Design a protein around this ligand. Structure first.
Ligand code: HEM
Ligand code: HEM
Ligand code: HEM
Ligand code: HEM
Ligand SMILES: O=C1C[C@@H](c2c[nH]c3ccc(F)cc23)C(=O)N1
Ligand SMILES: O=C1C[C@@H](c2c[nH]c3ccc(F)cc23)C(=O)N1
Ligand SMILES: O=C1C[C@@H](c2c[nH]c3ccc(F)cc23)C(=O)N1
Ligand SMILES: O=C1C[C@@H](c2c[nH]c3ccc(F)cc23)C(=O)N1
Ligand SMILES: C[C@](N)(Cc1c[nH]c2ccccc12)C(=O)O
Ligand SMILES: C[C@](N)(Cc1c[nH]c2ccccc12)C(=O)O
Ligand SMILES: C[C@](N)(Cc1c[nH]c2ccccc12)C(=O)O
Ligand SMILES: C[C@](N)(Cc1c[nH]c2ccccc12)C(=O)O
Lengths: 333, 342, 348, 353
């Protein structure tokens, strides 16, 4: 007969708490909280990696092409968002520890830090954080052996951003000899602008959308991440989100943005707590601490920044290329 | 140098995930969520027992008598309420699993259940849920589901002093109860008798009138029953009250005089104890709401049944709200008893 | 000149709506201000919920729901209602920063006013589909005038339950000369059970053989009772079920075939309706836990026993979509679900 | 007899929703959500100001001197943090509005902006945000969206004693600072000087390794920082640069309360200092949650109020807006427990109730 404790391998989970304070003969009560909090964070990182890798594989094995798999994809990405939302709230627990009580066992941690969280790095990589865009103080130095391996894989293997890019490139309606969404959009913006103080600034920005080369330049830097075609596909799904075939894809784009918002919210709630815990003192990891973590709360680490930025290029309803009754029929189930 | 992974024993924590569906050649994706969810609850149960045991020990070793330890007692009990709040919110994650997807792996779990969580039972016992008062499941004692060391650890948890018992003892020594001192109880009965008489005269001064006489007689009946020590002892034996009559007086002394400096942090403690009771019951209810959607309408009925005042250990602290009186009826503190508390 | 923030939001009304009765009667009590603001915030959100719910009711009433382009709008708004209800459950945390002792200093100035007099809460219960007969003995005589008028309209106009029921009855696949979901489901469950019993009978007499017989007979009784329409009609009339027999079949079709593109957002909608029932009952339970600390076993200013009556509202008697939850009772092995064939795959 | 709707003036609260989209004959459904969300924020701002003004008044009228009132002070400041926590979560509601749908009624709002929220500025000012704390754009434009009585309230919110000023005054009176008494600051400098000397000796005694010279330069970093605590001229210099806000003596009060938090008379005061930090953290989380949403709603597009939008709001997510920034930065100056000046039986009894 299967038993709860055996099923859950609690013989491992609940025998994994060793206070260094106690091991060096000066047991500090709050060190137990510090350990349990990190462990719970790490269990949830594992669940997020389990969800994220199953979704990467659904794109990578071509299953995403079968639209009956979209409910699964959006449920699993929504589940990632719900977990991250709990991980943002979970800082509330560690904030019941005073800086003063933390200061009593802090010495016994050196030089260990969150910089040595394999799962946190795997998570960043698998979503599509680029190493060349990371702020310094580098990242992978902390790791060695069978772990530095897994990290290299996570960097080399296809990211969620790349798989979503590939899928967005294949979006119905972009075909120049098909619905020709882009051609019609350039025309409608160009006309609508002419049919008009302020108009000169928005004229500039809107028509910038149609500059492949500029996009390629901003891309070459890393101020954009998606191919120019992927961006068209995304904008197609935004404007035609009510068309049956675009409903759940739109939900997916929304959830990809949610995961960026919640990852940055996690970075900021971490920062707000570390300020109270250390002030201006440096982290046991070696970094300036507070000031480095503040730098990670930027669009540098927003993988799906393109999806946020498309809100720049929103236009009146009237201008969106009307859906030809035959194209309507292609976008029905 | 100490390394993150080794410090946290992640070689144990992150190698503790075995899908029974995969072990039996039919891996079901959502079983991984089911496993991590329970493991996270159990880590947090372990943290709660760590705080709860530290606080029990502070009461038991007589350290709580030194009022410098009150900040630490109330910080740890508040921290238990903050963890319990997260554990209530944590059901949101397992609710992303459909009943249909749960149905694809639940056969591989049988006959294991949350009924076998050692830590959940330790937590219930250490707060002070009485064996006497538990709803029986399948006509049997909760402790049957446990054998060997786990069974003994649970006996110890039932027999050792509970949070309820240690708070009770501390409440009994609340300053001000001394008959030959401030004599809170004697003075309180006198002021309540006067308050009621003055109230009766204001009313005895219409349809609005005959209602207030019935209501007045209700509030009269209730307030005066507070001084009936035999009614109280009787409700004790029937487990409908949990604290001794004297502990109850101590709690009411803290409620009424909470702004007195020596009673400020003690009042926060009594608030945190009600907080833990309320959050344990919200845990039991959110569990129920989820199980309903997973299994349909029996387990679901025993669970709905744990969502009751039988499992509210500090039910007496809530029910004191029954006996609140106008501020101006509360016995005045003279400059000699103020001094003791200031 | 330009629209100003304060004028746009009519803050001249919103922030001039706070009158402490304690102060009006010459004994200002600080925490009364919190009591007022908390209730006003709840009522703004009730008005928002009614705005979303009325809009979704209309999309069903006018047949716009028949155009499946409108399903993202329907699910987004129903989801939005559950996000708001989540905040309103959390919002009790604010009023619990008020001690029972401080509440006791201004409580007297409230009576005989009570939450029973919340028009919007009653409008919300009625519009979702809380039935008059299945309300706890100890509602509408607390009201009069247009208010009493608006409540009657809310009792007679088509509820979300009735509108979802009608829509579930048109679910594709139920057609006896089409996919014939119900015929094939009965056939597959009957066959699946017959085979499960041969599997059990074939075993040599044992302890776990008899437990399996006992378990088989319970499973068989539950699953076959799904196909007993007279039972369903009997349970409708006792208020134990709410959805028509055919709407139940449509719901189970959406459950089983939820991954089929035409069923993906309908499944999200059914999930949302269960979310709203769960959050409404959580609202009632968080309300009960607070009122217990505030009043104990004292009677409410509105007449009721208080804590005891409020506890009675926390039952499946108030779950409008009970039937959506209880379809979990009738889940079956994946292999028993009638197969979709390249013609019915394409229709969906 | 009193009736619910009348008690709460719902004839005002629920007759305050006017969609501009509908007024200009193009009703947009999601505009209702936009209005109700702002109105709920403005009710809770009003409640926060009610709690805040009541705690300011307890300091200003001297009632805070009587330690009976400390439970009430901490309960109401904790209440403010519980409200702010709901207000941070409340953004999740308005995030169920897509940028696409927002774009359909946005045009009808211009040039109105949250920038024009009287109550938000009253809240900033009464906590104690100073003109020089505010980012150039904020400082320039914020006062000049207001006239008449609204202008007068803004001025009052700046002229009258802020929570920062009233807490500073109270911290200056913290028992144990008096040189003739416990002489906290003198004893602390002596124990830290002695403690650093013992540490230098421990480090110098180690065998001339690489790790040792890492301890040496790390010690010399920690020594400069700790001993800089006792340089009052440096404090006044960081005050001028607005990197610190509290008086040197208020800072000594705060650190006294921190180290001796378990002494009965410092238990609730320590809870107050924690609550003031919580309020600063939740105010900045409110600003950051606002930013994350405004990014999805506008992208790089400028706001209706006149600002760059995303980039201006992002610039308010800064410690220059943290009023009690000094209470956080005291963590820089934590020392081993054994260096904290020992409590004598006489001052112990002084810090009992
Ligand atoms: C009192 C609590 C905490 C303090 C004082 C703290 C402090 C720090 C500091 C100073 C850093 C910068 C690296 C360094 O110099 O060592 C850091 C990074 C990090 N911390 Fe924490 N931390 C705390 C809690 C947590 C928790 C609960 C987690 C959960 C896993 C966590 C995860 C991380 C991660 C992943 C990094 C690397 C982040 C990045 O590079 O972007 N920390 N922490
Ligand atoms: C799909 C999710 C879940 C289902 C269907 C479920 C079902 C049940 C059922 C039916 C029982 C009654 C005993 C029995 O029939 O064996 C039970 C009890 C219990 N479950 Fe769960 N459960 C779930 C998730 C959880 C989680 C996440 C926890 C976290 C620790 C948990 C903890 C418990 C505990 C402690 C009990 C004993 C409760 C008591 O006696 O008051 N369950 N569960
Ligand atoms: C100190 C806080 C509160 C207390 C003591 C309290 C007390 C009560 C009581 C005793 C009743 C039952 C009717 C009666 O006997 O008067 C009731 C019903 C109600 N209350 Fe509250 N209440 C509180 C807060 C709230 C809040 C914040 C709301 C928000 C809208 C609310 C909404 C209602 C509603 C709608 C009802 C009718 C519920 C039903 O019949 O199902 N209450 N309350
Ligand atoms: C779609 C939702 C929202 C958008 C697009 C938005 C946009 C903006 C923008 C662009 C600004 C900068 C001033 C300007 O250029 O106009 C601003 C400031 C502000 N918003 Fe919002 N906002 C939104 C929701 C809210 C809500 C719900 C509140 C609630 C009270 C609010 C309160 C404020 C306040 C107080 C300011 C001034 C902040 C400061 O000066 O630091 N906003 N908002
Ligand atoms: O000031 C510090 C402490 C340290 C830290 C944070 N989380 C941890 C978890 C495990 C561990 F061993 C060390 C840490 C860090 O990052 N800087
Ligand atoms: O239908 C069920 C499943 C089982 C259960 C709940 N939580 C668990 C955790 C681990 C485990 F192995 C089994 C369970 C239970 O009580 N009723
Ligand atoms: O004991 C009580 C208090 C009263 C109450 C609850 N919420 C209210 C809101 C407005 C009002 F005027 C009165 C109330 C109620 O229902 N029973
Ligand atoms: O694009 C926008 C919208 C506008 C805004 C935000 N909150 C408001 C509240 C009332 C109002 F009238 C306008 C607004 C702003 O600041 N930029
Ligand atoms: C057949 C297809 N699933 C079509 C496709 C691609 N990208 C999309 C985005 C939204 C909607 C549909 C699509 C495929 O090529 O994957
Ligand atoms: C000396 C004492 N600490 C007094 C005591 C007991 N219970 C209390 C409740 C509130 C305030 C004080 C007390 C003790 O006997 O523990
Ligand atoms: C044409 C149709 N929209 C079909 C329909 C009805 N109910 C459903 C449930 C799920 C999916 C589709 C339907 C209608 O009649 O409304
Ligand atoms: C008499 C006194 N309440 C003393 C005082 C001032 N600041 C403090 C901080 C913590 C504890 C006490 C104080 C007063 O002067 O206000």
């Amino acid at each position: 007969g299967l038993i709860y404790g055996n099923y859950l391998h609690l013989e491992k989970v609940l025998n994994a708490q060793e206070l260094q304070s106690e091991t060096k003969g000066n047991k500090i009560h709050d060190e137990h909280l510090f350990i349990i909090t990190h462990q719970a964070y790490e269990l949830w990182f594992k669940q997020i990696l389990w969800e994220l890798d199953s979704v990467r594989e659904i794109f990578q094995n071509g299953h995403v092409r079968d639209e009956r798999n979209m409910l699964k994809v959006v449920s699993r990405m929504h589940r990632v968002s719900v977990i991250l939302k709990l991980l943002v709230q979970q800082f509330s627990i560690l904030e019941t520890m005073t800086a003063l009580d933390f200061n009593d066992f802090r010495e016994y941690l050196s030089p260990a830090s969150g910089f040595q969280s394999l799962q946190f790095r795997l998570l960043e990589n698998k979503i599509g954080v680029l190493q060349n865009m990371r702020v310094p103080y580098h990242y992978r130095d902390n790791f060695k052996g069978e772990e530095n391996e897994l990290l290299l894989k996570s960097e080399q293997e296809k990211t969620l951003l790349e798989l979503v890019e590939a899928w967005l490139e294949r979006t119905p309606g972009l075909e120049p000899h098909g619905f020709n969404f882009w051609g019609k959009l350039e025309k409608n913006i160009t006309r609508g602008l002419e049919e008009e103080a302020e108009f000169q600034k928005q004229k500039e920005v809107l028509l910038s959308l149609f500059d492949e080369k500029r996009h390629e330049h901003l891309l070459s830097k890393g101020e954009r991440r998606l191919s120019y075609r992927a961006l068209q596909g995304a904008l197609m799904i935004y404007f035609y989100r009510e068309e049956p075939r675009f409903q759940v894809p739109f939900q997916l784009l929304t959830s990809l943005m949610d995961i960026d918002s919640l990852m940055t919210k996690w970075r900021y709630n971490h920062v707000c707590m570390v300020h109270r815990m250390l002030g201006s003192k440096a982290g046991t990891g070696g970094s300036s601490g507070y000031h480095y973590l503040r730098s990670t709360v930027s669009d540098r680490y927003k993988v799906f920044v393109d999806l946020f930025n498309l809100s720049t290029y929103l236009i009146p309803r009237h201008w969106i290329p009307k859906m030809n009754p035959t194209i309507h029929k292609f976008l029905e189930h």
